[PDB]
């Protein structure tokens, strides 16, 4: 198993790169637009050094033109300012392809607290929500205009110290593609009684809400001044030949008191799983679920838990909860079947409304093969 | 000489790592029961005998009705942490590990998490994170005629942590059961009248005499490692980890007098990781104002951290990001455990400023000790 | 090459025979408990670690009172078979074997007996044979104000049969306990209101909301082989039998549409002995009238038994001498188990005629699979 | 151990006999009589080939001469038309010696369903109780006459394919003896409050019930045209030198909540055990018993079970329950064989014990002619 | 031949001594419950599986109110000894040991103590010893409108004594629980009307129909040996002691007639240590006046102690320092247990002088027998 040698080398090379190169975060593109005209953009990253990820800043002004009715933030709120993201590397290989809300929840899981949030404390010194980094008005009254700010981190590298999934872009001139699909006047506002899953605001005045405008700025984070040796660039070959991706999917067919199993695919090393129980447009705090679990065929469940106990494990990961959104951390021992479906994510629902479904979100590693 | 232990240490650590890398972690429900505290409050749970047991997550829920005609009751400082009065664990060899109060176990759960155990932090996030699932919850007050719902969780540790198996238990002996004893709160412990000692109570107030539990429910989840790794000599196992006890225990001491050092000696042999001291000043729990200072001293008139109450509290804020409740003091000795053999006798000191009738110090300890 | 397995097979069979000839069969009580479902309904039973375990006979009795002022309730199609909601077994190595619903386990008990499990057949005999002992019994209706008494039995298999030890468990590991988890019916699952889904309920009717269990009692009897035979190399044991899992499992699938083939794929590696499909047509259970046909097909557009519901039912009458309840369909593949490796992917097919809201197919499987 | 050779040979010979001979069932005797005059008969079987058993057909007419009271079948009913049976082979050795009801219960255990019964089904085709093979009126009203039919199979051979216990009778002229003792006007009718164990009908009009007449026909089942070889007749010597017998016994001395143990003898290989709890004339559906079991000294119980669970095992054997107070135990695959008298016992721990309580035991066993 | 047992005896005794010298005796609470007999009276207690179990001390308390408007009730002869109606114990192998009435268990507790069980003797001491703690207590009468408080204790033996472990139970089998079943008195058994049979009742009198339990509480304490000694071959254990059953059982027999010997046969295999015979003369319990004589006879028309009632009572006064209650007769055969194998059939004889309707002899036995 010359793997030990490969891994040993990879890790050494990673450390030399981190020690010798210098981190840079640089603006690559900014744009302001009206969702009525366009909402899909293809950003072209710079081809320099080893790319670790992209910080995407999104600001928006929303006007409630209704005569007398207000609207209020949905549970996801500004996290729905970006509906989807897709990244293609210089070799035309896709990495992350997921929803803005799933990307945001992973950003939170990786930080260990609500992403870029300001924690409240008793400090008399005026720390606090001074800069409104991620912010949105709880409600926008009839005739009012609200200002929102949202940030997303699109990862290539797994972390600042683990370059698994990073992309070498000093390489060919072939361009990278960071595709962003923003919310628009058709997705951002939900009428009372409508499904608020993909919306930012919901309420009686929704039909008359509209974007005044949306702006985004993409910052690219990369390592420059890569170290050179005898043969040339000292590089972690395993890190750079591995993909670290986030992906989402939807599953339906839930029935009261019956195990609903979403199979994991083989080949992928699943680091985390998010399951959103969109119960026909209703999002409940565990009351519509009997239990959740992860199960291996012919070896039962490794963590069959009631909803509150499942939530307790999540509180240890992000210091809060995360209605209807369930998280599962498998970072230390990634789900890796080897045989398609040897392992599944389970939800046994207590109550199932019309048009119920589970929206799944995954973080995984897989070789470029 | 002494080199055998240096080798034993490496062998133990090596095996611990193999076990962690090769085994598969499992958390499984072992028992759930709903009961009326008026009928019974003490239960003996028999966990499953599978692989290496790391600990138990105990979920407790309750419905409490305040039947008083006019008066309300309010949560005591410990509140739902007093849903379990005492917890005691015995391994397959019938050896006792943790034997302590629910409140002490809970404060240690908090200390090891680095924040109030399983709490939801408040932030400025517009996204609707927050107290969505009410994992640990209890209404601040229960009005006359109202019913409140509570949820509490306790982690009963065997292993020190998820990565340090010191204290873990090998439960493979068929016919030799482990035992997790839970003594729950009941209608005589949960409700304190005005003026009575609130230490062990959940609610206190003018309506206390008419408060009652409608029911209490518990679910015990057992956390363990399955698929244990096998080698040439059979099961690869960290023998030191599995032959060491990681226990929490509590005690009570009295005899305090104003301005005089009250010293609680640490016993020998035990390696004390943390110490909690609760100054039950005759039923009054004060925010440091009844204390001149606290300290740890190795006899030989030598204090290592003699501090005024606020400065002592500052050290604790560095550990759990907030203060423990009034009258509860914490001391972290995790990196350099108090061990009388390597430092001589040591004691925990409290020099009280004010001492009411029936004053006492309730001590809670976290420690490692050899089975043999 | 492949000849090693041909030898292993003979060695396994030879040892199985020696074990059956030399050992002594024993059925012994391991635990009995009476409880109020309002307090608790989930139990974890720890069986004895003696010799080779073949299975467990679980006796369940209950008293149900219909407290409604005026309305009665009547047995659902499954009735007392729903006294146990779910059963799960784990062996000493903590490996899961059967994990299924009480109703599925019961239908398999029936399939393997060749007649309604433990039933009393009716004959013209003048000698007073008959339902003398009420082994499996439940009143057809419970009137307003009345109390009914029920008795139910389930056989939880480890070994495939009394002569085929495939699936049996060697429980000799001291300190490594087996676990038999029983999740019983309670006041929230046993009684269905008119119009509600009766699938998991015992009684349904206009008085359901006021029905309650007075008590439920269970007794677990463990069947095993003692006095295991010893040879030159020690214990003579069929290694393949003891390293194979014989399990029952159930699942649920939705997405049916009138006149369109609904296909449930069989997983690979498992050798499926029988398949049960329950068409829960949104709470309605019909006698084949909502189905065009059922089949088993090896993909490649090839059905091996595409049949109309009545003809499918005829095959089942040849197996259990009667029909399973409304909406319950059975398929015997015991002599030639469905195995995707030797036939490619295979699926169970139902082409529905009528599909109500919330329709789904509940599948129950009986299968053999390798531990490793 | 030249036994392997003996058994190997025995089995081969058995198969040749079954393959080469031809089965015959033949009437050997019929008789009609009035129980008031006689009720004990000694039937003389034919000495031909290998005898497997006897099918005994019994018919009877019972008249309730009471002025106004009826009677109703007891739990055993027509199974008590024959009170006892005893068979002696040509060598004066006894095989079965038991009661008619025990013989009938074994006939049922061996069939796997109530003996010669007609199962009820939903078939629209008119199968059913067409021929009334085993039949008796549920009640016989005052002044009425009821007609009954009962069949018993007295086995010598264990089954149609296992000739263990069969009898070679082409042998000497020495006669076989099939002794039959029938019910009479003193045993067939039980007064209200009297023990109905041995009776056919019980009720207020019992004192005035009587047999109009009883008739029996014995059919002998045997194998003819036995195969011959070099040394002569090819015969399974082990089969023919082994006795397959049914026997009954009675035991008393039961006390509430105390284990009542009936020891098994040594030498016999007990295939089945039947225990009837005659609780002072009352027969209950397990409610007077705590548990039943089979136990070996210094090795505890191999099947200590509550009455319903014990009954569950029986339901797997005969597809229904035996009558109230009748308990069955199958040990066919691994016969109880002590080697030391009483190493094994049948246990009944009674919950309630009435006056004159006792256990009536019935056994099926194999034993060498020695 | 037979020499193997002579060795086995010495090995058993040697190991018993080592166990007694090396182990540490522990008495520990396993369960406590307070209940209303109107709701429930039968309980199944699951004791702990630790080391060698010697027995259980069961504490029972009760509050009884006589709600009759005018009439009182008075204690029956057995009184508080009837708080427990029946006790049954099953070991981990599900084998039954003691299965008897509370009154019989209590009389044996007395016989083995050599005086009324846990009683306080009266003396002339001026120092205030006496009935200070009311260990076993019950008011002689409960007046109309009054409430009486009772306390009763029973020792349920497994081991024969503190020094003779014959009958003790090794409870180390994980997943195989022991079971101690207690069937308590309730409002239908505890109160006898005037003229009714007082045998099983606690109080009898004209106010009986209106008497009721306010509550009954029990606490089970388990006595066992911990820290079992280990040797070269592992655990040192007296195999004969641990494979022998020491049980108490009771029965009932009827059919007595004036001046005729009524004989109750002793069963074979059992070694009878003591015999108790209660002459329930149709609800009347007399002080020997309804009996001509009692005896023990080895058949063969041979009495070993045919005695008039007063002389029989004299032998008992030598054993317990007083008389058992009216109609209760005791026989000690501890040094030479009745064993039918070594003496042929033996029977206990009562030749009654007077026999009322519904007369019967209730027998209680103490005996040793082999598990196998």
Swiss-Prot record, chain A:
What name does UniProt use for this protein?
A: Major capsid protein P3
Q: Where in the cell is it found?
A: Virion
Write one Pfam family the protein is assigned to. Answer: Phage_Capsid_P3
Q: Which gene encodes it?
A: III
Keyword rRNA-binding appears in the UniProt entry: no
UniProt keywords (A-Z) are: Capsid protein, Virion
Q: Describe its assembly.
A: Homotrimer.
Q: Which InterPro entries match?
A: Phage_PRD1_P3, Phage_PRD1_P3_N, Viral_coat, VP_dsDNA_II
Source species taxonomy: Viruses, Varidnaviria, Bamfordvirae, Preplasmiviricota, Tectiliviricetes
Function noted in UniProt = Major capsid protein self-assembles to form an icosahedral capsid with a pseudo T=25 symmetry, about 66 nm in diameter, and consisting of 240 capsid proteins trimers. The capsid encapsulates an inner membrane and the genomic dsDNA genome. The major coat protein P3 and two assembly factors (P10 and P17) are needed during the assembly of the virus particle inside the host cell, when the capsid protein multimers are capable of enclosing the host-derived membrane, containing the virus-encoded membrane-associated proteins.
Q: Does the keyword Zinc apply?
A: no
Q: Which GO terms describe its cellular component?
A: viral capsid
Domain of life here?
Viruses
- Coarsely, its chief localization is virion
């Amino acid at each position: 198993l010359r793997n030990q040698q490969a891994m040993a080398a990879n890790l050494q090379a990673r450390q030399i790169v981190l020690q010798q190169s210098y981190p840079v975060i640089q603006q690559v593109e900014t744009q302001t637009f009206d969702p009525a005209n366009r909402s899909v953009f293809d950003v072209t990253p710079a081809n320099v050094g080893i790319v670790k990820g992209f910080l995407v800043k999104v600001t928006a002004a929303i006007t409630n033109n209704h005569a007398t009715e207000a609207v209020a933030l949905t549970d996801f709120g500004p996290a729905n300012l970006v509906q989807r993201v897709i990244y293609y590397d210089p070799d035309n290989q896709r990495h992350t392809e997921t929803s803005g809300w799933h990307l945001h929840f992973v950003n939170t899981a990786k930080q260990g607290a609500p992403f870029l949030s300001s924690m409240v404390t008793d400090s008399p010194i005026k720390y606090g929500d001074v800069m409104n980094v991620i912010d949105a008005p709880a409600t926008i009254a009839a005739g009012a205009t609200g200002e929102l700010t949202m940030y997303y981190w699109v990862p290539l590298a797994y972390s600042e110290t683990d370059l698994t999934g990073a992309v070498l872009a000093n390489v060919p001139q072939s361009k990278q593609r960071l595709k962003l699909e923003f919310a628009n006047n058709n997705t951002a506002f939900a009428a009372v009684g409508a499904n608020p899953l993909e919306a930012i605001y919901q309420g009686a005045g929704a039909a008359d809400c509209e974007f005044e405008e949306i702006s985004y700025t993409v910052y690219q984070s990369y390592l420059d001044q890569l170290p050179v040796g005898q043969n040339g660039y000292i590089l972690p070959l395993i890190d750079l030949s591995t993909l670290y991706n986030l992906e989402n999917s939807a599953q339906a067919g839930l029935t009261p008191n019956v195990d609903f199993v979403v199979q994991y695919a083989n080949l992928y090393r699943y680091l985390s799983t998010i399951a959103v129980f969109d119960n026909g447009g209703s999002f409940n705090a565990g009351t519509d679920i009997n239990y959740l679990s992860q199960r291996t065929a012919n070896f039962s469940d490794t963590r069959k838990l009631d909803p509150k106990t499942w939530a307790a494990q999540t509180r240890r990961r992000i210091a809060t909860d995360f209605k209807g959104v369930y998280y599962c951390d498998n970072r230390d021992k990634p789900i890796y079947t080897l045989q398609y479906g040897n392992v599944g994510f389970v939800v046994n629902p207590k109550t199932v409304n019309q048009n119920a479904r589970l929206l799944m979100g995954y973080e995984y590693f897989t070789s470029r093969t």
